[PDB]
């Protein structure tokens, strides 16, 4: 399969397999190609994705089931946040930047929840940027494929740090909520240059929330109490102001962010309600300075 296209190089390791930069001998363009390591359902859910297109998703161009191995061709982009914000440690990243970063993400996670398509594993990973301004959102609806596994193929651990609370408590109904709020822990981290929930095991994720957002309560999240994995013997923490969350962040951002990060994912900012927000209303397009 590797012969019917050149391996520029291997360009890492992903949740499910090695990635690979490539040239498409047919099209000439550069793609990443991705070996998915381990089932017609999964084949289905993925082949359905070729159709999701949208300028903030990363553009699937190919599924292709050979020799029993599953290999993802998608649009290639050079960087990811991740890296992005690593590089960008000693000085920050611009608020005008911050912004629209993520004013296009919340367009891409309405354009899919819009098609009742959720990611599931948000994190600056799989948040890729290019020359031009553009954020996308990669690898959305393989967790729906695939699951969030504990560890990766390298046996790597599978980040915690974005899931949301329900996901944590032992909820197996996911709602477009569980994108809202990694969306809000990653707008937190472009901001503050550091994760919000940094956590090293289930427990420890869900406590740092708590630390910070309060344990939550029937008051906050009615049902909370009823969850599978809800212990009544959790600390009961109190509610921190996000003043001191994500300084210095202005009232609008840290209103968008609270609501984004709100308990109940019923009550959770939808997508389409946080365009609306005054947050957006100066919002730009700058360029980040990239060096590839
Ligand atoms: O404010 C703070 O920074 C901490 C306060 C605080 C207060 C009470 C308990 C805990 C806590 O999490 N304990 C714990 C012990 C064993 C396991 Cl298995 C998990 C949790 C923490
Ligand atoms: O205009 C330029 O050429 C670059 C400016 C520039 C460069 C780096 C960082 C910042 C900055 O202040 N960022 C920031 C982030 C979060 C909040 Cl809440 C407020 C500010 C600004």
Same mark, same amino acid.
């Given at each position: 399969?590797m012969?019917? @296209?050149?391996?520029?190089?291997?360009?890492?390791?992903?949740?499910?397999?090695?990635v690979?930069?490539?040239?498409?001998?047919?099209?000439?363009?550069?793609?990443?190609?991705?070996?998915?390591?381990?089932?017609?359902?999964?084949?289905?859910?993925? !082949?359905?994705?070729?159709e999701?297109?949208?300028?903030?998703?990363?553009?699937?161009?190919?599924?292709?089931?050979?020799?029993?191995?599953?290999?993802?061709? @998608?649009?290639?982009?050079?960087?990811?946040?991740?890296?992005?914000?690593?590089?960008?440690?000693?000085?920050?990243?611009?608020?005008?930047?911050?912004?629209?970063?993520?004013?296009?993400?919340?367009?891409?996670?309405?354009?899919?929840?819009?098609?009742?398509?959720?990611?599931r594993?948000?994190?600056?990973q799989?948040?890729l940027?290019?020359?031009?301004?553009a954020?996308?959102?990669?690898?959305?609806?393989?967790?729906?494929?695939f699951?969030?596994?504990?560890?990766?193929?390298?046996?790597?651990?599978?980040?915690?740090?974005?899931?949301?609370?329900?996901?944590?408590?032992?909820?197996?109904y996911?709602?477009?909520?569980v994108?809202?709020?990694?969306?809000?822990?990653?707008?937190?981290?472009?901001?503050?240059?550091?994760?919000?929930?940094?956590?090293?095991?289930?427990?420890?994720?869900?406590?740092?929330?708590?630390?910070?957002?309060?344990?939550?309560?029937?008051?906050?999240?009615?049902?909370?109490? !009823?969850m599978?994995?809800?212990?009544?013997?959790?600390?009961?923490?109190?509610?921190?102001?996000?003043?001191?969350?994500?300084?210095?962040?202005?009232?609008?951002?840290?209103?968008?962010? !609270?609501?984004?990060?709100?308990?109940?994912?019923?009550?959770?900012?939808?997508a389409?309600?946080?365009?609306?927000?005054?947050?957006?209303?100066?919002?730009?397009?700058?360029?980040?300075?990239?060096?590839?």
């Amino acid at each position: 399969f590797m012969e019917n @296209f050149q391996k520029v190089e291997k360009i890492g390791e992903g949740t499910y397999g090695v990635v690979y930069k490539a040239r498409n001998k047919l099209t000439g363009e550069v793609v990443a190609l991705k070996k998915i390591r381990l089932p017609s359902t999964a084949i289905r859910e993925i !082949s359905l994705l070729k159709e999701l297109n949208h300028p903030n998703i990363v553009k699937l161009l190919d599924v292709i089931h050979t020799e029993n191995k599953l290999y993802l061709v @998608f649009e290639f982009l050079h960087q990811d946040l991740k890296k992005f914000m690593d590089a960008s440690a000693l000085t920050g990243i611009p608020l005008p930047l911050i912004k629209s970063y993520l004013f296009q993400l919340l367009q891409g996670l309405a354009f899919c929840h819009s098609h009742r398509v959720l990611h599931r594993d948000l994190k600056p990973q799989n948040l890729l940027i290019n020359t031009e301004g553009a954020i996308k959102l990669a690898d959305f609806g393989l967790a729906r494929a695939f699951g969030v596994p504990v560890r990766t193929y390298t046996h790597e651990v599978v980040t915690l740090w974005y899931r949301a609370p329900e996901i944590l408590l032992g909820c197996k109904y996911y709602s477009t909520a569980v994108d809202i709020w990694s969306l809000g822990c990653i707008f937190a981290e472009m901001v503050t240059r550091r994760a919000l929930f940094p956590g090293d095991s289930e427990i420890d994720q869900l406590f740092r929330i708590f630390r910070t957002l309060g344990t939550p309560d029937e008051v906050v999240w009615p049902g909370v109490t !009823s969850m599978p994995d809800y212990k009544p013997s959790f600390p009961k923490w109190a509610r921190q102001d996000f003043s001191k969350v994500v300084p210095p962040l202005d009232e609008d951002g840290r209103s968008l962010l !609270s609501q984004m990060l709100h308990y109940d994912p019923n009550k959770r900012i939808s997508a389409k309600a946080a365009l609306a927000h005054p947050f957006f209303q100066d919002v730009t397009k700058p360029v980040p300075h990239l060096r590839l």
